[PDB]
């Protein structure tokens, strides 16, 4: 599923991301835009052989099991394919564990480089929430 901007904002608010660990909703929408272009089916292979999955590009070296990242962890206890569903619940629940691990949203390189320090409220401007 390719989400619209305000559609995704509303889904993320419903799932408890607005102000989660202090990050306003626009931060999460901005991260999803630059990580996946709002596409739940996005995948990208990394140099070390791990793969990133879904609307928030969650990495198989630490967070999910894809059966092909030797020596990796599965800290969200899910198959990585669950992160590609049109229902974003699994992605959001895993993202909450990632953002709570001490590094905050700096875990998402696109957030650090394209959202951090910008006017992120612009990402939810005009939406009915
Ligand atoms: Cl915001
Ligand atoms: Cl933080
Ligand atoms: Na893994």
From Swiss-Prot:
Assembly information from the UniProt record: Monomer.
- Annotated substrate binding lies at 101
Q: Give any GO molecular function from the UniProt entry.
A: beta-N-acetylglucosaminidase activity
Quote the function comment for this protein.
Answer: Lysozymes have primarily a bacteriolytic function; those in tissues and body fluids are associated with the monocyte-macrophage system and enhance the activity of immunoagents. Has bacteriolytic activity against M.luteus.
Protein name (database record):
Lysozyme C
Enzyme Commission number, as recorded = 3.2.1.17
Residues of the C-type lysozyme domain? 1-129
Miscellaneous: Lysozyme C is capable of both hydrolysis and transglycosylation; it also shows a slight esterase activity. It acts rapidly on both peptide-substituted and unsubstituted peptidoglycan, and slowly on chitin oligosaccharides.
Q: Where in the cell is it found?
A: Secreted
* Tissue specificity note: In the egg white and polymorphonuclear leukocytes.
The entry's cellular-component GO terms read: cytoplasm; endoplasmic reticulum; extracellular space
Family of this protein: Belongs to the glycosyl hydrolase 22 family.
Q: Name one GO biological process term.
A: defense response to Gram-positive bacterium
Name the InterPro entries on file: Glyco_hydro_22, Glyco_hydro_22_CS, Glyco_hydro_22_lys, Lysozyme-like_dom_sf
Q: Which reaction does it catalyse?
A: Hydrolysis of (1->4)-beta-linkages between N-acetylmuramic acid and N-acetyl-D-glucosamine residues in a peptidoglycan and between N-acetyl-D-glucosamine residues in chitodextrins
Q: What intrachain disulfides are recorded?
A: 6-127, 30-115, 64-80, 76-94
Q: Name one Pfam family in it.
A: Lys
UniProt keyword annotations, A-Z: Allergen, Antimicrobial, Bacteriolytic enzyme, Disulfide bond, Glycosidase, Hydrolase, Secreted, Signal
Q: Where do the catalytic residues lie?
A: 35, 52
User: Known SMART domains for this protein?
Assistant: LYZ1
Q: What class of enzyme is it?
A: hydrolase
Gene behind the chain? LYZ
